[PDB]
Design a protein around this nucleic acid. Structure first.
Ligand SMILES: [Zn+2]
Ligand SMILES: [Zn+2]
Ligand SMILES: [Zn+2]
Ligand SMILES: [Zn+2]
Lengths: 201, 199, 202, 199
DNA sequence: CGGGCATGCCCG
DNA sequence: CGGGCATGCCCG
DNA sequence: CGGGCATGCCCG
DNA sequence: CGGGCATGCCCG
């Protein structure tokens, strides 16, 4: 209905929260998050796990929506899709049941549904919200990205921003958080450099 | 003829603002607080944030119209220099009037209006409430000739007036700010603020 | 069926075709100036620009001479040379109208000046008949007129152009051809002097 | 037939030549005599000078065929990567199959060829006599992908094989040269020669 | 008729 | 995202 | 317009 | 596992 995904955090009634645990001081590390720059550094198609949390059990049939947007205004109008070279390829499109075009995928959850909103044209994947696990503090949705931040054709070196939403069976918004995403060949280097430049300021 | 470039918040405190875009010679867009100056780059995306605390006239809408500052010119209309109006540069691909100066980018309900006997050009969008969690409705504008175009604004400054209205024309509010469309806002902003300050 | 990329290459034919330029103002704001060092004229939009034609032997009746512009740089070579959309319609010189304002090159005076618009190549030019040099005159003088400032947007913007003069037969042929960089601007002298210096640095 | 190559001047000595280019490192194109390698930026106009000794036959023409160098990749046909193919940028007029690497501009008589089952793509154009008072027949080519393109030439050196031939299949003109498509050609060129001199 | 500037654009 | 030139045009 | 950086991936 | 490299692109 709306073509400019709201970017602003807003926990809402319940206190929707997104956090990343595992850390890896390496360069070719599948994934690693930078708290100082609220930016996730993930590799191509590598298992990326984020952890959701809330204070009170949300309404029945709630959802978790993950959708990509561009950080800059000049680009934000353009739908974030998978580049031709990675779309038409066999690798990962061979019997996966997820639209070749989709950038973000959800790993290990049949209940996950990929969405192409017909008017907006935006793409996003959803899963029913889950109560953590009995002995855990958070809910672990584990995501995937199928294009580097620099894929000529798709992203094209443009910075994105993954937005995680706590939704109603109908769409009404109960929560939201966001952060910058940069898919690389190796997040060790990329992250350090960006935090060293931040330190350089 | 000659809309009222006169400020008026109205009933619902109307606040159109700008974010913190960086200062850089060739920055796509930048805004000055000392002056009400929007330094803009041709055809680039310029995000302008509109805040409204109590919004409730469904069918209400927001207009953006361009006007000349100096009085002798304010009676003249703000069109595009025939060079860009005729050129193939930004005119194909879009579904917006060849001659208007202002264009909305992230919206398709937009209305480019050519006043029948007024001759003023402006573009209206519907007022959409800010999305749950944030405070301002964000409209995306881009200007299609540089302020210095011969055949158009022959270097004469222009003011932009954003009016929120009732489905049937009735100005609930309005605001203004001078805008400049140049190759590099950063170097132009730096200079403008300097000369005015000195005096 | 025509030639796609008019060659600029000079051609002194059986007749000895030459294109000379008389003494010109070194004056900064000059109406027109020339450069044999940089072999390029510098003329003002819509100002009378003289040109000296010369030949050892005289050619047959019906023989005329063609002036056509073409971009100097290859990545621009294919674009035809027309006037900026602005000037082509601009009411400031289509009045006292005579020829299509598409055309950049016009001819002053001569009423035998018929323009061309090659349907095939969509190429624009202009042609007048070869009158033998005025009695006691070495040169057959044709006035060419240029309409857009080499820096006009929409039109040839800041993209150098070449002006090919062609000693052409009565019907489709080439007997002689000489070329030379054209540069339309506001300060012909300020420009030429700035150009030649820049050259006297290499 | 498939991977030809060996030069062959022929009846009318076929000579492929390049004019003097821009010394600049990021120029549209440059040719390296010592390295018999053409360096040009993607989609930029590359002029090539074709010459012959005697008025070649009647309805004869010229064709450009690109082939991978390494004796390994010869098998593989050389086309545009998926991205530059299904991408807007240069297919919005396309009197040229979006798949072809080599393209000709200016000429309307260009014909793009796809071999039957052993399909190789190429561009041909009727040969034309040098315009009166010139010795060079000039053809303006375009190279739609970068030799670095992942999914395309994927950094695989290639040869453009120019051949003069007669409609009746008789190929009696064969001149070939190395071709590299890249962002700034001067740089790679000087880098290519610098080291080969030393190594 | 030359000096000088503003602002687009390309390059020490 | 900074330094410096282009080149139409105004000044006087 | 050249010098420097960005960024997938080669190499050991 | 990281350091260094080529190659497209942006900063000054
Ligand atoms: Zn991709
Ligand atoms: Zn304009
Ligand atoms: Zn013009
Ligand atoms: Zn490619």
């Amino acid at each position: 209905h709306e073509f400019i995904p709201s970017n602003t955090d807003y926990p809402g009634p319940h206190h929707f929260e997104v956090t990343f645990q595992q850390s890896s001081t390496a360069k070719s590390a599948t994934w690693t998050y930078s708290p100082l720059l609220k930016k996730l550094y993930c590799q191509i198609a590598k298992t990326c796990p984020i952890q959701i949390k809330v204070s009170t059990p949300p309404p029945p049939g709630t959802a978790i929506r993950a959708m990509p947007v561009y950080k800059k205004a000049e680009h934000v109008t353009d739908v974030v899709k998978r580049c031709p070279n990675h779309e038409l390829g066999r690798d990962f499109n061979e019997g996966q049941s997820a639209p070749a075009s989709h950038l973000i995928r959800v790993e290990g959850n049949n209940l996950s549904q990929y969405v192409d909103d017909p008017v907006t044209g935006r793409q996003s994947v959803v899963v029913p919200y889950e109560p953590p696990q009995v002995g855990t503090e958070f809910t672990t949705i584990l995501y995937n990205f199928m294009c580097n931040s620099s894929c000529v054709g798709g992203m094209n070196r443009r910075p994105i921003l993954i937005i995680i939403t706590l939704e109603m069976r109908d769409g009404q918004v109960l929560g939201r958080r966001s952060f910058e995403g940069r898919i690389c060949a190796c997040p060790g280097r990329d992250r350090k450099a960006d935090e060293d430049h931040y330190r350089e300021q």
